[PDB]
């Protein structure tokens, strides 16, 4: 099955700041497993969307990862940006936190008062994050394949052997990262996924922080993030080309894929 939603994409429509949908957020008022979390929704989607969760690295808090609630929401997703019970949380302990906050999502889904009462398909989940919280996104996938899409960004783990991941993996790297270096961590990562489609996509001269909030590429990984979520979480090939392509772009150091159609 499909679960289209919106207008056919354009390159010009996914690389602006908003895509077609009227987005609102709230606090979740009683975190559930987790330290905080805003959710960010669209109003007007046209049917039932999935819920992606989204966690941020050591010491960091919700602003580092916020920018990717408003963009993805206005696609077309439920989208809860995530502070851990502890800044110093590892990134076991970050994956567990990730999964409480899609449970509460699909708590919040059911509940008459909220306002995404209805609005999520509770069976399509997403897991996204920076750093630790990118490593957690991938233990989430591991441990959890009925998980439809991940995609971290300069992820971090004192383990790279993801070799059973079986979900759709877009890996965002940032090139000169000099605290979770691509050669050992983002490229090994990569390399170890034989069963999944996947993709790296390593930002020309990003630092670790290259793929946060206020990063200056806002346009290519916004539009690889939504094609990648559309193509893979709703089922939606109207997003074969963008999630799949190389985008032959200036602003990208190194591409790679497997297992990536381009066919609709």
Known sequence: GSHMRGPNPTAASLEAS?????????????????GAGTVYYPTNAGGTVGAIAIVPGYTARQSSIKWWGPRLASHGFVVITIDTNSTLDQPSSRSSQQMAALRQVASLNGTSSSPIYGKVD??????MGWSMGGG????????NPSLKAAAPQAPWDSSTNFSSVTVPTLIFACENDSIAPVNSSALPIYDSMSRNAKQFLEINGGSHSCANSGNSNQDLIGKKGVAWMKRFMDNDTRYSTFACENPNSTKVSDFRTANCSLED
Do not use: D, H, K, Q
């Not at 509770?122 to 897991?127: E, F």
């Not at 957690?136 to 441990?143: D, F, K, P, Q, V």
């Open 122 to 127: 509770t069976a399509r989940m997403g897991v």
């Open 18 to 34: 908003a895509g077609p949908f009227t987005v609102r957020s709230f606090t979740v008022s009683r975190p559930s497993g987790y």
């Open 136 to 143: 957690g996104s991938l233990i989430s996938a591991a441990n």
